[PDB]
Design a protein around this ligand. Structure first.
Ligand SMILES: Cc1cc2nc3c(=O)[nH]c(=O)nc-3n(C[C@H](O)[C@H](O)[C@H](O)COP(=O)(O)OP(=O)(O)OC[C@H]3O[C@@H](n4cnc5c(N)ncnc54)[C@H](O)[C@@H]3O)c2cc1C
Ligand SMILES: Cc1cc2nc3c(=O)[nH]c(=O)nc-3n(C[C@H](O)[C@H](O)[C@H](O)COP(=O)(O)OP(=O)(O)OC[C@H]3O[C@@H](n4cnc5c(N)ncnc54)[C@H](O)[C@@H]3O)c2cc1C
Ligand SMILES: NC(=O)C1=CN([C@@H]2O[C@H](COP(=O)(O)OP(=O)(O)OC[C@H]3O[C@@H](n4cnc5c(N)ncnc54)[C@H](O)[C@@H]3O)[C@@H](O)[C@H]2O)C=CC1
Ligand SMILES: NC(=O)C1=CN([C@@H]2O[C@H](COP(=O)(O)OP(=O)(O)OC[C@H]3O[C@@H](n4cnc5c(N)ncnc54)[C@H](O)[C@@H]3O)[C@@H](O)[C@H]2O)C=CC1
Ligand SMILES: COC1=C(OC)C(=O)C(C/C=C(\C)CC/C=C(\C)CC/C=C(\C)CC/C=C(\C)CCC=C(C)C)=C(C)C1=O
Ligand SMILES: COC1=C(OC)C(=O)C(C/C=C(\C)CC/C=C(\C)CC/C=C(\C)CC/C=C(\C)CCC=C(C)C)=C(C)C1=O
Ligand SMILES: COC1=C(OC)C(=O)C(C/C=C(\C)CC/C=C(\C)CC/C=C(\C)CC/C=C(\C)CCC=C(C)C)=C(C)C1=O
Ligand SMILES: COC1=C(OC)C(=O)C(C/C=C(\C)CC/C=C(\C)CC/C=C(\C)CC/C=C(\C)CCC=C(C)C)=C(C)C1=O
Ligand SMILES: [Mg+2]
Ligand SMILES: [Mg+2]
Ligand SMILES: [Mg+2]
Ligand SMILES: [Mg+2]
Ligand SMILES: [Mg+2]
Ligand SMILES: [Mg+2]
Ligand SMILES: [Mg+2]
Ligand SMILES: [Mg+2]
Ligand SMILES: [Mg+2]
Ligand SMILES: [Mg+2]
Ligand SMILES: [Mg+2]
Lengths: 472, 472
């Protein structure tokens, strides 16, 4: 009644990867396809270079520039790679299967090719020997009413399109109104919730667009726009040194952004929202803020496919943020499922930096398991022995190395702290820090094509105004 | 009951331009905004470099690369320019007004700025002293049933997006079917109707995508695609020398395109179409062709706003292709309306070449009228005297100079004939002709930005596969 895909052409173990983001793609880049048969399930046919997503809505870079098709990474592999463009809806640990839905395409990047007899929008289950879970996390509204109906997350490419569309629409409407109309002022106002680096960069890029481009042809309109950054803690960018946070805040304010600290959004309606400030003395004030565009850049929560898995594994029943993993990124209470990135919790921060390091670590471990015959044998064995097998063969546990953090602030200023272990190599803000920010992000891009395209976008930006088309 | 916009701040004449394509933008580039007050009505906020439109659906170039916002041309003008993003629905010659609808935005690129009190989706009429009509022409189905419902024109940016979407969707579906399934073969088949340069280049670019890119990751899928070029005349590209047409046809066939000459599409259904061949002996055969993607690249017809104007002007009642104009591009039976490009008929071909030459000619005439006080006086005068006034002051009539024609054929071959007057400088086909085709098109681009972007797209193409995203 339910189609099952179980490739037994080879005696290479079937490694199944969920997702096409930081964990999945970094893992894919390092996994040995000569030793393993690799399959990928993800509803998104491309990798997204998340740190430049805030630059996309106003066209500092193009949406296409920061994405790279999964297929292009896969063509570089020596062995067999299969990509299922579908969503994993259920992880079935006791039968070693993943259920998929919303199937759109299957791509078998090998020329023998076995017809699988799948049809679009028909469920199927995919058999694995090893599961690597990297489906990431979804934006968290914290139960605040209205944010889903009236705000825009900043998490995926379509969010960037939506934001451009809303804001460009607001600008056209607003410019038809007479100066000093409160409705005009509402349309020209943007609220960015979340004073983490995502919200800060979003606010900064928007301000860049308004000041550098919009101002060239509608200066009076540009003058009236008001961007708000709303943050619940007493400082923005709290992962940085306090003095860098103050530098950032003063800079943002200097570019005309209004920063609301100690402030939380309580309720969102279609044209206004309620913000409460909890002052240091303890008193609580409240302000209703009319807004044209709301961008919700706070926090992530676990995905339904992952929370369901919490129930199916006893050791995992007490999980909340993500799957709990051991020293070897093995999901607790499972001997063949691994979890990396934001869908896993190990006490580390939910960043690309961690996801990328975990992926590379895990792929190296898979190199070693391929030299030890017993691993692939415990697959068929009755006993979950893979936990023991890591300590037995003295695999080192995963150790995260924090390399620091960066944040663009708009108007050619950035802050940065670069490190390794206990050594700090760079830490500060300014004009040169901005150039460093560019060179560094360019270096972290996972593909030559995307790297060139971003580079071409920045060159073009030196001579011309950003592309800000309503429907492109 | 109907708002009327009549700027009388200055004693500069109000020149009103309809459209934002080849005629409108070329004219705008050359019109003297120190002598004239310039306004523009067009539903499309940008100029479209039409000759590269066939390269967009498969990402040989990107859609953004071949467009340039009207506003960027306008910023370069010294005087006052206003852009109404709306559709001209009625030209009202006796009151010197144009009715607009579907208003989205108004942009006054000048600092004084008078609030006009317009609202979105409220009709208005725009007063002019001089009207320049350049709304172009729309695609012509020839009454063939089904082409509107089931095909895609190749006329505007959204057509390019639609075609990519259809064909990318068909490829995913087809690759899920087993080899030799007729439904798979149907999904992999494309029909391009029209053997003019538009249809040829569309066919050529698609074949390029299939052979150079698709083949790299789904070679068997690439092998099964079949592109058809359907043309009713006995030769393709009939504006060229017969020998260049034969070269082109053999080339297309050599790249695996199937060329159907003396063949017309009689009827289009959702999954097949009826094609009839009228052989040279006189006999008529018919073939039903299953297709996944239909591209309709034949012919244009006059727009409704233009046909309505036919009825309102006596001298224009017998018009069919477009507005009839005199030696000075003045609309016959009107003393203040001019028509250039495809909305005008003067016995010249409907090309960008003609539209661009007319525009530049007309803007130079407007330079001369600005030295002769009587022109701007006949505006207020009771008598239509502007017709006489051109012969009187010995303005030379517009003379078109054919510079030739180019066509890309796919697989790095093109044909080209370059001329001026009776002299031919170049005429032939081949690899070098392709490089010439690139250098020449780059030269005809109207903006530095668009020119750089196209150039970057071609560079990227030298190293990487085309971007072919379903939803970007
Ligand atoms: C705008 C923005 C900027 C950021 N900037 C930085 C930065 O500068 N530095 C930094 O360290 N971190 C940054 N991050 C955070 C970083 O992107 C994440 O920590 C990282 O993406 C986590 O990697 P992941 O693979 O776990 O999830 P992701 O990278 O998000 O990838 C998850 C993938 O799984 C796929 N998927 C989703 N649901 C399913 C399903 N049901 N089945 C199968 N597949 C599924 C998705 O399509 C996605 O491709 C940023 C995040 C955002 C939103
Ligand atoms: C795919 C393609 C490729 C081509 N390649 C070539 C080539 O290589 N060489 C060549 O010489 N010619 C070429 N042409 C022909 C050339 O593009 C046209 O002749 C060109 O458009 C000149 O016509 P125009 O400027 O009058 O109108 P267009 O350039 O078509 O533009 C007319 C403008 O009027 C606007 N408009 C439409 N309706 C209304 C309304 N109701 N009110 C107000 N404004 C309106 C439109 O938005 C548009 O911006 C090509 C055409 C196509 C479709
Ligand atoms: N350039 C860089 O180095 C970047 C790094 N990152 C990392 O990616 C991860 C993703 O996190 P982010 O999206 O940036 O979120 P974040 O969690 O770092 O910040 C969200 C912020 O919004 C605030 N907030 C929560 N609820 C609120 C409410 N109801 N009303 C008002 N404010 C509220 C919180 O105090 C919080 O600090 C982070 O861990 C971050 O460190 C993200 C972007 C850029
Ligand atoms: N690179 C270049 O020089 C380019 C120039 N152009 C211009 O675009 C303009 C469009 O002019 P058109 O009059 O439309 O010529 P067209 O050449 O686009 O004509 C379309 C062709 O399809 C044929 N056809 C018509 N009905 C058919 C049917 N029902 N079934 C099958 N075939 C059918 C016609 O005979 C005709 O040859 C041309 O003047 C052309 O020069 C367009 C693209 C490129
Ligand atoms: C591949 O992923 C990565 C990211 O994104 C997911 C990142 O943000 C960062 C950013 C971390 C710091 C700021 C830079 C590290 C580089 C220096 C030269 C280390 C010495 C790094 C390094 C990274 O490797
Ligand atoms: C690989 C090149 C990039 C250099 C480009 C061609 C230069 C920028 C374009 C200029 C010349 C045009 C802008 C001038 C207008 C008039 C303003 C890169 C490195 C290639
Ligand atoms: C601006 O628009 C234009 C188009 O489309 C909008 C065209 O298709 C073409 C194509 C026609 C030929 C191939 C162009 C030749 C131009 C030069 C090389 C001719 C040199 C002769 C003397 C007068 C110098 C041209 C020229 C053009 O200008
Ligand atoms: C510069 C390259 C990366 C390598 C790509 C994938 C290979 C492209 C190889 C081709 C054949 C070179 C281009 C052809 C020349 C211009 C002749 C990157 C760094 C770019
Ligand atoms: Mg196997
Ligand atoms: Mg991932
Ligand atoms: Mg990602
Ligand atoms: Mg995530
Ligand atoms: Mg994850
Ligand atoms: Mg025009
Ligand atoms: Mg055009
Ligand atoms: Mg100016
Ligand atoms: Mg036209
Ligand atoms: Mg016209
Ligand atoms: Mg179809």
């Amino acid at each position: 009644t339910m189609k099952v895909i179980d490739p037994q052409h080879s005696d290479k173990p079937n490694v199944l990867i969920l997702g096409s983001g930081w964990g999945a793609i970094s893992f894919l880049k390092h996994i040995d396809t000569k030793k393993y048969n690799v399959s990928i399930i993800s509803p998104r046919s491309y990798f997204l270079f998340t740190p430049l997503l805030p630059s996309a809505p106003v066209g500092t870079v193009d949406e296409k520039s920061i994405i790279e098709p999964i297929v292009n990474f896969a063509l570089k592999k020596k062995g067999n790679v299969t990509y299922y463009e579908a969503e994993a809806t259920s992880i079935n640990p006791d039968r070693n299967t993943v259920t998929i839905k919303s199937l759109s395409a299957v791509s078998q990047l090998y020329q023998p090719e076995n017809h699988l007899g799948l049809h679009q929008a028909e469920p199927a289950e995919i058999k694995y020997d090893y599961l690597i879970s990297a489906v990431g996390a979804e934006p968290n509204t914290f139960g605040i009413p209205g944010v889903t109906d009236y705000g825009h997350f900043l998490k995926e490419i379509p969010n960037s399109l939506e934001i451009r569309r809303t804001f460009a629409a607001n600008l056209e409407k607003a410019n038809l109104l007479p100066k000093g109309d409160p409705e005009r002022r509402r349309l020209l106002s943007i609220v960015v919730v979340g004073g983490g680096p995502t919200g800060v960069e979003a606010a900064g890029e928007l301000q860049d667009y308004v000041h550098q481009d919009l101002r060239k042809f509608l200066p009076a309109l540009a003058e009236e726009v008001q961007i708000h950054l709303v943050e619940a803690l007493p400082i923005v960018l709290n992962m940085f040194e306090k003095k860098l946070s103050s530098y950032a805040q003063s800079h943002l304010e200097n570019t005309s952004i209004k920063v609301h600290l100690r402030t939380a959004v309580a309720k969102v309606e279609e044209k206004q929202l309620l913000a409460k400030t909890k002052h240091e003395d303890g008193k609580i004030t409240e302000e209703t803020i009319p807004y044209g565009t709301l961008i919700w850049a706070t926090g992530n929560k676990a995905r339904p496919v992952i929370t369901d898995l919490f129930k199916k594994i006893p050791e995992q029943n007490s999980s909340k943020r993500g799957l709990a993993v051991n020293d070897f990124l093995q999901v607790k209470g499972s001997n063949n499922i691994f979890a990396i990135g934001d869908n896993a919790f190990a006490g580390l921060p939910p960043t690309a930096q961690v996801a990328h390091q975990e992926a590379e670590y895990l792929a190296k471990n898979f190199d070693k398991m391929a030299q030890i015959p017993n691993f692939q044998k415990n697959l068929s064995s009755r006993k979950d022995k893979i936990d023991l097998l890591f300590e037995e063969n003295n695999f080192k546990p995963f150790k995260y190395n924090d390399l620091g953090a960066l944040a663009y602030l708009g108007s050619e200023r950035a802050i940065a702290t670069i490190r390794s272990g206990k050594r700090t190599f760079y830490t500060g803000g300014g004009l040169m820090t901005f150039y460093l920010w560019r060179i560094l992000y360019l270096s972290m891009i996972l593909s030559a094509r995307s790297r060139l395209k971003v580079f071409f976008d920045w060159i073009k930006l030196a001579f011309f105004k950003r592309d800000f088309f309503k429907g492109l």
